[PDB]
Amino acid sequence: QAGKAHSEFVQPLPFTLPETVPLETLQRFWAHPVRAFFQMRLQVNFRTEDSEIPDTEPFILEGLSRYQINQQLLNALVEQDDAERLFRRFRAAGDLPYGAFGEIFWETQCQEMQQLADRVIACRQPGQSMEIDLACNGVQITGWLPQVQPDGLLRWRPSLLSVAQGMQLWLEHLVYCASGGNGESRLFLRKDGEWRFPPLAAEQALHYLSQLIEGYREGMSAPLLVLPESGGAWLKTCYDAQNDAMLDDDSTLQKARTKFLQAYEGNMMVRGEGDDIWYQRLWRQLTPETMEAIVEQSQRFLLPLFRFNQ
Amino acid sequence: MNAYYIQDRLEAQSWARHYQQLAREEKEAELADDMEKGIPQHLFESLCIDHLQRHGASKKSITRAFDDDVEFQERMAEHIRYMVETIAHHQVDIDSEV
Amino acid sequence: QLAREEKEAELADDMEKGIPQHLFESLCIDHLQRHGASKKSITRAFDDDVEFQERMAEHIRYMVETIAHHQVDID
Amino acid sequence: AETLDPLRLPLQGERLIEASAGTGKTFTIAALYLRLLLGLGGSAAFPRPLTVEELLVVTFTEAATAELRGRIRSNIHELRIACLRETTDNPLYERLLEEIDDKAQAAQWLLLAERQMDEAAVFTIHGFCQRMLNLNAFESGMLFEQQLIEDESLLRYQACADFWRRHCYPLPREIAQVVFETWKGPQALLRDINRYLQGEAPVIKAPPPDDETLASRHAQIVARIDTVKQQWRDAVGELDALIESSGIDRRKFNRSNQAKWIDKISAWAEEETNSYQLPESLEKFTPRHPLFEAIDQLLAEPLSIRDLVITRALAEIRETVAREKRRRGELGFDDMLSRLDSALRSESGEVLAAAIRTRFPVAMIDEFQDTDPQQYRIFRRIWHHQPETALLLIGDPKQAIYAFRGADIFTYMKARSEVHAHYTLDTNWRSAPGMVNSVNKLFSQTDDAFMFREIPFIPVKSAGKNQALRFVFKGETQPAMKMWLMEGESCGVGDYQSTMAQVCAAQIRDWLQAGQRGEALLMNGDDARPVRASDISVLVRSRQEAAQVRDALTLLEIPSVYLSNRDSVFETLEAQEMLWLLQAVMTPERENTLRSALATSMMGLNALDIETLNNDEHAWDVVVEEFDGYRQIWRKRGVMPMLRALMSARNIAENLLATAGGERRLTDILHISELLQEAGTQLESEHALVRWLSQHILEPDSNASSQQMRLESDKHLVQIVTIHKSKGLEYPLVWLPFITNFRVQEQAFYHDRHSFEAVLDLNAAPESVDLAEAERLAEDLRLLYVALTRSVWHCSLGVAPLVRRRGDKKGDTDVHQSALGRLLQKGEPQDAAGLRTCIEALCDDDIAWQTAQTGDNQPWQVNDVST
Amino acid sequence: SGIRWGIDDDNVRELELPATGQHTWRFGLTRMLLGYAMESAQGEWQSVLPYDESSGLIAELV
């Protein structure tokens, strides 16, 4: 027992941010910042073995299978294209259930997606994709924003409301307000969830963008710890939109701790954000010292999310 | 080579189903204590001050019900708790629905 | 005696029409949307669930009867 | 009931023996085994001496059959030497030598009995039928060679999907709309009937006719609903009723909901008409309309296709599984017990039972409280009335917790009524006299506390050897039983589990803090010894409770282990990392697969080391060289030698033992390396080996050999164990913090009080629900009796007035639903004040109650180390 | 491509299971061979959607 114990996996690494950062890089970075530093920076990606092929024809659709159909159906409903064509297309591929169960599942999906579409169609206007070139902290950002209407940014996805979707719209709205683009930005999700950001001046737009780009070079140096869901759950309980200030009360802090562990530890119904390959490699067990570091770092970047959200 | 292995696996899943139902009831009561603090009795007192005066109810009658009478404040706290717990019941159900 | 209780019940029946269930819903939609109650969840309680409306109109019947009782006491 | 002397027990016909927890019923079987060998007891002796191979002993657990075999083997050896020496130092062998006539011939019989102990027959129920049906094949009608199938879940879901294909797919959309509401598919349909598929098929109350199809029941109820749909259409628009203060004018909204629901057909769900129906309107208060009562006719009988589809599935799937296993030739453990039952029930089974009476002209069944209707009917059809063959049934009805496994207490109740002989053992050798009086007083509060008249509670008495047992904590002796009562009126289950696990973990470290200084001692007479974390045991009902005590106890820095944990090795993170290794060694040339293996926690490479590895391509080529050398050893030797060379070169085995909690990590790596060597010899293809590992990682196999092994040094760590896996063991110090918790079974399943037959009711009628809840409550009472008798010196249990009632009403508490709450309150619901007064009433000198108060001082002391 | 159940449609009826026409090796092969000739964006033909993943020389393995 004379060997040395394993040192902490996290270590500071030198990094120099180039002058050209594609927008697709920042969007893929802020989606999973911990996963990024493994793949983006250190080129480390754990490949999950392909799941065993199901031994029977699907009786009910679940997971990514029904998510693709909900995305293919939502795009066809907003365009007001015939849904029976897509139904015969999916049934021809056999991806749906057989016979009547393929009809029962399709109509209860078309009933939920039509409710989401009627909200998107009302505010939707024809628009064209625009290209973006910006200078922030001496760094050039290039990319494309599809379907930009004169009213603003309009995005719709068939999923549950999450902070990862709000952060995705946040970076897309800041890059929209930094070059012209007077107007709002809206995102619609299942179960009435919505993300709506009012317009901002180019001053503040480049300020918060400078904080996001600074977090990117910070994520490339050290494995910055920000949990969009769990860190957002702790931040939602503490932050108050009326007074625009976070509560320092201890009673609300203990509730935020229970809500943070509730988002970290997953149940049988919904899998939690805490358990995953990227988060297990850093620490095998979650300590309160690192739980505070995640809270402080999430309090920094994820604060303008709930601040300007309405 | 366990003969009861199949029964032992079904019993292990039965307990995980019970604590998933218990954790859904505890989450309902957690949102119950929060929404109870969101609608204090003076909001319903103000709602009565508005619409009741046109039907002949004096302002002192509504004041004596909410502020003076203790049993009315007792039954209102139980009714607010039942209303909140039912709204929290449907809210958790909608959140539980995939 | 018997007339006083009849005027109190008649006055409570007139106030029952003045405070519909959608009046409590308007107050429950404005204040409770901050605490995380969705519009669909509040709409389900005040409309879909029958047992909720049964106990709702029962307590509303209890509220307008107790307030009318204090009103006659003032008279 | 009468007391039992082992040497005075006559063996003829059927005899029943009840042995309380801690009575050493295993020691009694050895005495009757030596009695059956020598033919002793005179008029109470067996008619003739017997051979070891002719004695049949049945014990449900395999581990107990091997222990009883060695226990009898040692007792035959001790008695044989005692016969040659003619003198012995033991009372039992002394009384045996007094009854022995010729000791020389008896010593020769024990010598021949000692040499035959290899073929000595001690079997399980499933190990018996396997040997018996393979003995006489023609009476059973079974193939001579049959391979046992370990898991029937794969063939059950296969046959469940075959039923859902033929009986669902052809159905029209209007009928399929109703089937989709009950369950999504065969996966949910299987989970409903899965408990009903295992074991003997029970009887269904009010079964549907055999000729009724799905379309017949569908068109019948549709016509029943369509009549009320037509009648409410015509009679709508008229309000005449007696107005009550309970109702109000807002019923118009409920009236409109009936008009909107009628216009659409194919909807099996019903809008709520309950307030409008005549009986409920009579309850609220009369119109007396004909269709007003016709709604009552609709609401009285439940409308569902559930009971019909389940009945057709339960019968057909069981036939499909049995036909598929007969095609493959494989047999299950439940199918062998059903084979012998079907063989004896056949007309030619009478000759089969005659060969069993000749093979084993006697029987002794250990753990008779655990049994099945198939088992008892087999033992009854043989040994019920026979002139020369006896029967011995040993078991404690209070000890059967196994109803989840299919054990029926009513089977024992039916067996007890049929046997006229009853014998009980009154000497409890396990625990101290203070615990004996505490257990007897707790169950003597009411009459027939177990709720079944056929199971009495009888007092026992401590032996003379244990009368000196005492437990001291901080000077003056501590009582044998201590109940910890929580403070406050209403307590939630989440608040009950939290606080009590913190109070229990606080009292454990206080016993450990006083145990290292020698203050707390376990004293037998004048002898004593400090209290180690070994003798401290925590008994929880489920695994979710074990992890909740584990986190609270580890927060105080007391290392503890779960002994009953069933978690597979493949669920751990290292098992997933073992896949990224073997896959990277397979393709060392790929840069993404190799970097993924070196970034795993098993290799132990820091993020700085990975960064310096990506910066220099030369160091990367060297790692490819060593991973190529690992692939060579992988191909020439196997999985185990390569992992041995990888752990020796990387020095990760030493580094893991240096990391805190890394020895638990290393035990899993070596155990996986043993399973990969096991599956590596069968499959020569290296890629099929990686596919075998990845396949087991996705779905855990749950096999006993695939279960996580116990970590070393856990003998000195606090032992957390389930109530079920702790039966038959000895735990000097026991904790029952969560014992007050309970769960209610919503399904209706029970056994009739008359026919004693398992009866499932697919209908939700509250009758069968009340008789089902009474059997669950009696099972929880037996779960408490076993958990209370595991202790020797002291045991502590948490008590709180927990309330699962909706709205947290202040009228009464639900503790009476719990097992321990029913015994303190005498089955009478009370308040939190009444629960506290009933606790203070029964505590004298043995039971003692203290309030549960949360406190924290210091987690623990290190005790340092030795090197 | 959705290849799960038995090889042919006649094999399905031989097991006394209702004939479907999908999730079979014949359904999958035809789905894969149709995608080689026609792009999946065109539409259905026999009520079998073409499988677009292999339109090229890699389709020779099919």
Residue numbers in the entry:
A (entry chain C): 812 to 1121
B (entry chain A): 41 to 138
C (entry chain E): 61 to 135
D (entry chain B): 5 to 289, 304 to 885
E (entry chain C): 500 to 561
Describing publication, verbatim:
In bacterial cells, the related AddAB and RecBCD enzymes are helicase-nuclease complexes responsible for initiating homologous recombination from double-stranded DNA breaks (DSBs). This activity underpins many key DNA transactions including DSB repair, phage restriction, and conjugal or transductional recombination. For example, phage λ Gam is a potent inhibitor of the Escherichia coli RecBCD complex that helps to protect the phage DNA from degradation. In this work, we present the structure of Gam bound to RecBCD unveiling an inhibition mechanism based on protein mimicry of a DSB.
